[PDB]
Amino acid sequence: SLYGQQQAYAEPFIEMMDTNPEFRDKRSYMKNEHNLHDVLKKFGNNPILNAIILTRSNQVAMYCQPARYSEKGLGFEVRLRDLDAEPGRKEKEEMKRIEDFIVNTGKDKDVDRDSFQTFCKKIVRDTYIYDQVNFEKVFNKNNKTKLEKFIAVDPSTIFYATDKKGKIIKGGKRFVQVVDKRVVASFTSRELAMGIRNPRTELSSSGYGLSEVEIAMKEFIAYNNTESFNDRFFSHGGTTRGILQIRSDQQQSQHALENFKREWKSSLSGINGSWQIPVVMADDIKFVNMTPTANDMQFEKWLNYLINIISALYGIDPAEIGFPNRGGATQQQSQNKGLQPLLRFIEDLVNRHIISEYGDKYTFQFVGGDTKSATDKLNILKLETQIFKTVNEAREEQGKKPIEGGDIILDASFLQGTAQLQQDKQYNDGKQKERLQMM
Amino acid sequence: SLYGQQQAYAEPFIEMMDTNPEFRDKRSYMKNEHNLHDVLKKFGNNPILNAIILTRSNQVAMYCQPARYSEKGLGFEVRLRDLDAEPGRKEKEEMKRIEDFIVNTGKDKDVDRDSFQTFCKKIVRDTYIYDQVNFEKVFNKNNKTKLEKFIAVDPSTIFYATDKKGKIIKGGKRFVQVVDKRVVASFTSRELAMGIRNPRTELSSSGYGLSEVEIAMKEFIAYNNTESFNDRFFSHGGTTRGILQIRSDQQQSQHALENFKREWKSSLSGINGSWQIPVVMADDIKFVNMTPTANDMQFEKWLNYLINIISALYGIDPAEIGFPNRGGATQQQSQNKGLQPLLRFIEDLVNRHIISEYGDKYTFQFVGGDTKSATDKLNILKLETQIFKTVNEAREEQGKKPIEGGDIILDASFLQGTAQLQQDKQYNDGKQKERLQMM
């Protein structure tokens, strides 16, 4: 049921007793807690995590515009599934309409609704915090077959529904929304998407993704309490430099000490009388140091290590978030592993969920920001054509029609060989005139 | 039986007594524990391991799209087994259908089922944690000969089945699924695949792969308890800076000490009165230090060594996971040893298990991300053609048909020699006219 009809089991044979029959709960890795997103919501406010989220969101936001409206190639585009297939006036108009629909996130403009930029900015946060993304579709009521609007829904409230036997359902309504432990609404598979970026095969998770926050929970709390320890020097006591002991047979009366303080403040306090030296005629005086000569941050390398491993979990370069790399440099490759997989994930999700409603012959893809790869591709072609490939063969290979002029291989020598062969060929073929002349 | 009919023994002659007759258990290397995947599941949650898994999964996810739908060459492709063999309209359509089938992981689209991207992301995790991968096939019920769907199954629940004599079976059902120590279902060899990345020949393992987690178990627990030791400075006591001793003939009453604390807090605590100096008139005062002047992380090099060897076991560069390389640099070659073998393993598995159902004449392979190797190949050809190879010979060599113009060797000098030879040849051959004229 979970994926379809199959011979094997890919779901827990025995249900979790404490869970409600109507749905299957999402739980921690070790089954330590049957309620996970509640504690992940607490870490949702962490600065380091939020810094990563915001950096990735800003990176994605640039790509979130259509290509044909952009003077430069950066953006997204819709095209026919086959690159070699020709376009058409009807299909071009349909693709333009679909692109405008995605840009406006609906059939018609509405200021009250999200632009696709904000939708992606929501999706990245939901992907990197909870590792679960969901968005609702609004099919036309006059015609169930077609689509009108689509918007995002928070993943924390959405669960997998279950049948009376407790097994996850396939047919009909499959996803259910829960608020304050009460069932509110449920959705058909087509009506609500489910994107999992970090899936797992073990029966315990039952298909729910694994979020990096759960993995780094210990590290996150360690970072938090380390920061608290550093800040408690100021927000709490212990900032004394030392104690000035004065030996005496009798402890001086508090009035005398107050007058002592008055004299000290009047003579030495502040910039006024800063450089002056007092004089005291007691038996013996000592100054005992309680703190070192100069203070500084503590456990610096510990923080660097923690943030480095946390960054490595998300695949982001620590240098972007203002920390040193414990190895390597101390950007293209960092971007290649960090951003491009996320863009491809969003691409696949949006494609297979939205474009399925219009037709198989179309697809959605991002474009731009990859000049170097295209440069190397063109260099491959430019080196290949010198010896191997004809101009017309390459042009046909890349979904274009040939140009008259012969299927020439571009080299100034090669042309002279063909020209010389043709010139001498015409000389030899001209001797057939003499051959017939004797007749 | 294990591999086929053979003269030698490649399975334990005497069965393990404590194992159930229905299947052969998978056990540790030293036979210390007869149950292994249970303890490996515990280490499945480790951050370092999960970081490696996620990095490799993100690396693989980029390649997991078809080539002909991608503007750039990165992706996968299906082609005829012989590169020199010509294509055809029928075969091209069949290959396109097969590629779409692999992309959708079934005969028809289904949102409820995994895309091949998520399938690969599952496979890498199962390959690097357990060193065992399995996926079920769903043949058409109306026709057993052909295939409809295929999906992944967790390797922890799957075992090798055994006969009444305890020997592993070849014919019929060979693989069995066990849940909570109960047999649930069993599968034919064609119906369920078995991929082993790190095989062994010793009879003790009986063909089961060896997982790197078992090898690094000691190192993993050492890393865990080292991290716990570092964190217990904050999560547990021992954070005192020192003790302020004040000598007195009598221990002061607790009321006096409380008033002492009140005065101290009122005068010195917090930012308020931070720079002030107290005064005390006791006989003698000391401050004894219990911790050093400045704290920092401990056993740093030990952690670096541990993570370096763990990374070397998996073949991943430590620099990717935010650690320094103890040798070398302190990326192409690291990728070449790390990623490409995994891609080739997935390639071989998918090929020999899926494409076998359609025909021998087809094959599945990845493509792209290897411009430098192709550049060197083209450079080999470009240097060879100057002296050695004709244009038409090379074109024939690479599964293409010749171009009219002669089998020329590309060098501006060589063409002049042929042209000069032909020009003088025609001069000499023209003297046959004079030879016949005298007749």
Side-chain angles (χ1 to χ4, degrees), chain A residues 310-322:
Chain A
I310 287 172
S311 295
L313 269 166
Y314 278 83
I316 184 61
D317 188 357
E320 304 298 302
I321 55 171

mmCIF file with all atom_site columns, all heavy atoms in Angstrom, chain A residues 310-322:
data_model
loop_
_atom_site.group_PDB
_atom_site.id
_atom_site.type_symbol
_atom_site.label_atom_id
_atom_site.label_alt_id
_atom_site.label_comp_id
_atom_site.label_asym_id
_atom_site.label_entity_id
_atom_site.label_seq_id
_atom_site.pdbx_PDB_ins_code
_atom_site.Cartn_x
_atom_site.Cartn_y
_atom_site.Cartn_z
_atom_site.occupancy
_atom_site.B_iso_or_equiv
_atom_site.pdbx_formal_charge
_atom_site.auth_seq_id
_atom_site.auth_comp_id
_atom_site.auth_asym_id
_atom_site.auth_atom_id
_atom_site.pdbx_PDB_model_num
ATOM 1  N N   . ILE A 1 310 ? 28.729 20.731 11.490 1.00 0.00 ? 310 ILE A N   1
ATOM 2  C CA  . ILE A 1 310 ? 27.342 21.073 11.180 1.00 0.00 ? 310 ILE A CA  1
ATOM 3  C C   . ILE A 1 310 ? 27.225 21.538 9.733  1.00 0.00 ? 310 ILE A C   1
ATOM 4  O O   . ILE A 1 310 ? 26.293 21.155 9.013  1.00 0.00 ? 310 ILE A O   1
ATOM 5  C CB  . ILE A 1 310 ? 26.814 22.125 12.177 1.00 0.00 ? 310 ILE A CB  1
ATOM 6  C CG1 . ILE A 1 310 ? 26.568 21.457 13.536 1.00 0.00 ? 310 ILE A CG1 1
ATOM 7  C CG2 . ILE A 1 310 ? 25.522 22.800 11.662 1.00 0.00 ? 310 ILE A CG2 1
ATOM 8  C CD1 . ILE A 1 310 ? 26.218 22.410 14.671 1.00 0.00 ? 310 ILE A CD1 1
ATOM 9  N N   . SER A 1 311 ? 28.164 22.373 9.284  1.00 0.00 ? 311 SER A N   1
ATOM 10 C CA  . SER A 1 311 ? 28.159 22.830 7.900  1.00 0.00 ? 311 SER A CA  1
ATOM 11 C C   . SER A 1 311 ? 28.356 21.665 6.942  1.00 0.00 ? 311 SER A C   1
ATOM 12 O O   . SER A 1 311 ? 27.710 21.597 5.890  1.00 0.00 ? 311 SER A O   1
ATOM 13 C CB  . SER A 1 311 ? 29.247 23.883 7.698  1.00 0.00 ? 311 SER A CB  1
ATOM 14 O OG  . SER A 1 311 ? 28.974 25.049 8.456  1.00 0.00 ? 311 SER A OG  1
ATOM 15 N N   . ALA A 1 312 ? 29.253 20.739 7.288  1.00 0.00 ? 312 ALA A N   1
ATOM 16 C CA  . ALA A 1 312 ? 29.504 19.600 6.416  1.00 0.00 ? 312 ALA A CA  1
ATOM 17 C C   . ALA A 1 312 ? 28.266 18.725 6.291  1.00 0.00 ? 312 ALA A C   1
ATOM 18 O O   . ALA A 1 312 ? 28.043 18.113 5.240  1.00 0.00 ? 312 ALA A O   1
ATOM 19 C CB  . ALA A 1 312 ? 30.682 18.782 6.941  1.00 0.00 ? 312 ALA A CB  1
ATOM 20 N N   . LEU A 1 313 ? 27.457 18.646 7.350  1.00 0.00 ? 313 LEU A N   1
ATOM 21 C CA  . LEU A 1 313 ? 26.220 17.876 7.258  1.00 0.00 ? 313 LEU A CA  1
ATOM 22 C C   . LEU A 1 313 ? 25.299 18.457 6.192  1.00 0.00 ? 313 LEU A C   1
ATOM 23 O O   . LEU A 1 313 ? 24.733 17.719 5.379  1.00 0.00 ? 313 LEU A O   1
ATOM 24 C CB  . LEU A 1 313 ? 25.512 17.841 8.611  1.00 0.00 ? 313 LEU A CB  1
ATOM 25 C CG  . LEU A 1 313 ? 25.863 16.675 9.538  1.00 0.00 ? 313 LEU A CG  1
ATOM 26 C CD1 . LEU A 1 313 ? 25.376 16.953 10.947 1.00 0.00 ? 313 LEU A CD1 1
ATOM 27 C CD2 . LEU A 1 313 ? 25.257 15.380 9.019  1.00 0.00 ? 313 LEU A CD2 1
ATOM 28 N N   . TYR A 1 314 ? 25.147 19.781 6.169  1.00 0.00 ? 314 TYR A N   1
ATOM 29 C CA  . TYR A 1 314 ? 24.311 20.434 5.171  1.00 0.00 ? 314 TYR A CA  1
ATOM 30 C C   . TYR A 1 314 ? 25.016 20.619 3.832  1.00 0.00 ? 314 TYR A C   1
ATOM 31 O O   . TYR A 1 314 ? 24.362 21.012 2.860  1.00 0.00 ? 314 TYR A O   1
ATOM 32 C CB  . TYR A 1 314 ? 23.841 21.795 5.690  1.00 0.00 ? 314 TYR A CB  1
ATOM 33 C CG  . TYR A 1 314 ? 22.640 21.721 6.604  1.00 0.00 ? 314 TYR A CG  1
ATOM 34 C CD1 . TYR A 1 314 ? 22.785 21.423 7.952  1.00 0.00 ? 314 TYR A CD1 1
ATOM 35 C CD2 . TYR A 1 314 ? 21.361 21.957 6.122  1.00 0.00 ? 314 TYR A CD2 1
ATOM 36 C CE1 . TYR A 1 314 ? 21.690 21.358 8.792  1.00 0.00 ? 314 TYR A CE1 1
ATOM 37 C CE2 . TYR A 1 314 ? 20.260 21.894 6.954  1.00 0.00 ? 314 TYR A CE2 1
ATOM 38 C CZ  . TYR A 1 314 ? 20.430 21.593 8.288  1.00 0.00 ? 314 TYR A CZ  1
ATOM 39 O OH  . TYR A 1 314 ? 19.336 21.529 9.117  1.00 0.00 ? 314 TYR A OH  1
ATOM 40 N N   . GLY A 1 315 ? 26.318 20.353 3.757  1.00 0.00 ? 315 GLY A N   1
ATOM 41 C CA  . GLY A 1 315 ? 27.050 20.513 2.518  1.00 0.00 ? 315 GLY A CA  1
ATOM 42 C C   . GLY A 1 315 ? 27.486 21.926 2.206  1.00 0.00 ? 315 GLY A C   1
ATOM 43 O O   . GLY A 1 315 ? 28.018 22.163 1.115  1.00 0.00 ? 315 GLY A O   1
ATOM 44 N N   . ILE A 1 316 ? 27.284 22.869 3.122  1.00 0.00 ? 316 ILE A N   1
ATOM 45 C CA  . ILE A 1 316 ? 27.636 24.267 2.900  1.00 0.00 ? 316 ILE A CA  1
ATOM 46 C C   . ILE A 1 316 ? 29.075 24.503 3.338  1.00 0.00 ? 316 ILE A C   1
ATOM 47 O O   . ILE A 1 316 ? 29.552 23.911 4.313  1.00 0.00 ? 316 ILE A O   1
ATOM 48 C CB  . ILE A 1 316 ? 26.659 25.205 3.644  1.00 0.00 ? 316 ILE A CB  1
ATOM 49 C CG1 . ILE A 1 316 ? 26.957 26.683 3.351  1.00 0.00 ? 316 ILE A CG1 1
ATOM 50 C CG2 . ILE A 1 316 ? 26.701 24.977 5.159  1.00 0.00 ? 316 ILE A CG2 1
ATOM 51 C CD1 . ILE A 1 316 ? 26.834 27.090 1.893  1.00 0.00 ? 316 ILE A CD1 1
ATOM 52 N N   . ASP A 1 317 ? 29.767 25.366 2.608  1.00 0.00 ? 317 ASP A N   1
ATOM 53 C CA  . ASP A 1 317 ? 31.134 25.721 2.962  1.00 0.00 ? 317 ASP A CA  1
ATOM 54 C C   . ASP A 1 317 ? 31.127 26.575 4.231  1.00 0.00 ? 317 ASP A C   1
ATOM 55 O O   . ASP A 1 317 ? 30.400 27.574 4.287  1.00 0.00 ? 317 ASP A O   1
ATOM 56 C CB  . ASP A 1 317 ? 31.791 26.482 1.811  1.00 0.00 ? 317 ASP A CB  1
ATOM 57 C CG  . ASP A 1 317 ? 33.277 26.713 2.025  1.00 0.00 ? 317 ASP A CG  1
ATOM 58 O OD1 . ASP A 1 317 ? 33.799 26.336 3.094  1.00 0.00 ? 317 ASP A OD1 1
ATOM 59 O OD2 . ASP A 1 317 ? 33.925 27.276 1.120  1.00 0.00 ? 317 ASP A OD2 1
ATOM 60 N N   . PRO A 1 318 ? 31.897 26.219 5.268  1.00 0.00 ? 318 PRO A N   1
ATOM 61 C CA  . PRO A 1 318 ? 31.913 27.068 6.472  1.00 0.00 ? 318 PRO A CA  1
ATOM 62 C C   . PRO A 1 318 ? 32.354 28.497 6.208  1.00 0.00 ? 318 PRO A C   1
ATOM 63 O O   . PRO A 1 318 ? 31.956 29.403 6.950  1.00 0.00 ? 318 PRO A O   1
ATOM 64 C CB  . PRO A 1 318 ? 32.898 26.342 7.396  1.00 0.00 ? 318 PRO A CB  1
ATOM 65 C CG  . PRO A 1 318 ? 32.805 24.931 6.999  1.00 0.00 ? 318 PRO A CG  1
ATOM 66 C CD  . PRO A 1 318 ? 32.572 24.930 5.516  1.00 0.00 ? 318 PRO A CD  1
ATOM 67 N N   . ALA A 1 319 ? 33.173 28.727 5.177  1.00 0.00 ? 319 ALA A N   1
ATOM 68 C CA  . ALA A 1 319 ? 33.672 30.072 4.910  1.00 0.00 ? 319 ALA A CA  1
ATOM 69 C C   . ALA A 1 319 ? 32.539 31.047 4.619  1.00 0.00 ? 319 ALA A C   1
ATOM 70 O O   . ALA A 1 319 ? 32.679 32.251 4.865  1.00 0.00 ? 319 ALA A O   1
ATOM 71 C CB  . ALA A 1 319 ? 34.655 30.042 3.742  1.00 0.00 ? 319 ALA A CB  1
ATOM 72 N N   . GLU A 1 320 ? 31.411 30.555 4.098  1.00 0.00 ? 320 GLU A N   1
ATOM 73 C CA  . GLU A 1 320 ? 30.303 31.444 3.770  1.00 0.00 ? 320 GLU A CA  1
ATOM 74 C C   . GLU A 1 320 ? 29.657 32.020 5.022  1.00 0.00 ? 320 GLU A C   1
ATOM 75 O O   . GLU A 1 320 ? 29.147 33.145 4.990  1.00 0.00 ? 320 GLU A O   1
ATOM 76 C CB  . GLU A 1 320 ? 29.262 30.701 2.931  1.00 0.00 ? 320 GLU A CB  1
ATOM 77 C CG  . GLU A 1 320 ? 29.814 30.083 1.656  1.00 0.00 ? 320 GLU A CG  1
ATOM 78 C CD  . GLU A 1 320 ? 30.381 31.116 0.702  1.00 0.00 ? 320 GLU A CD  1
ATOM 79 O OE1 . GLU A 1 320 ? 29.635 32.034 0.305  1.00 0.00 ? 320 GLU A OE1 1
ATOM 80 O OE2 . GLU A 1 320 ? 31.576 31.008 0.348  1.00 0.00 ? 320 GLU A OE2 1
ATOM 81 N N   . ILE A 1 321 ? 29.674 31.275 6.125  1.00 0.00 ? 321 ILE A N   1
ATOM 82 C CA  . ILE A 1 321 ? 29.016 31.692 7.357  1.00 0.00 ? 321 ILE A CA  1
ATOM 83 C C   . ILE A 1 321 ? 30.023 32.274 8.353  1.00 0.00 ? 321 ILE A C   1
ATOM 84 O O   . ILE A 1 321 ? 29.776 32.267 9.558  1.00 0.00 ? 321 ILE A O   1
ATOM 85 C CB  . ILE A 1 321 ? 28.211 30.543 7.987  1.00 0.00 ? 321 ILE A CB  1
ATOM 86 C CG1 . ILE A 1 321 ? 29.098 29.308 8.209  1.00 0.00 ? 321 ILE A CG1 1
ATOM 87 C CG2 . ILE A 1 321 ? 27.015 30.206 7.103  1.00 0.00 ? 321 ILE A CG2 1
ATOM 88 C CD1 . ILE A 1 321 ? 28.445 28.205 9.026  1.00 0.00 ? 321 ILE A CD1 1
ATOM 89 N N   . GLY A 1 322 ? 31.147 32.786 7.864  1.00 0.00 ? 322 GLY A N   1
ATOM 90 C CA  . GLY A 1 322 ? 32.109 33.459 8.719  1.00 0.00 ? 322 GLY A CA  1
ATOM 91 C C   . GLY A 1 322 ? 32.805 32.561 9.718  1.00 0.00 ? 322 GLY A C   1
ATOM 92 O O   . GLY A 1 322 ? 32.944 32.939 10.889 1.00 0.00 ? 322 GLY A O   1
#
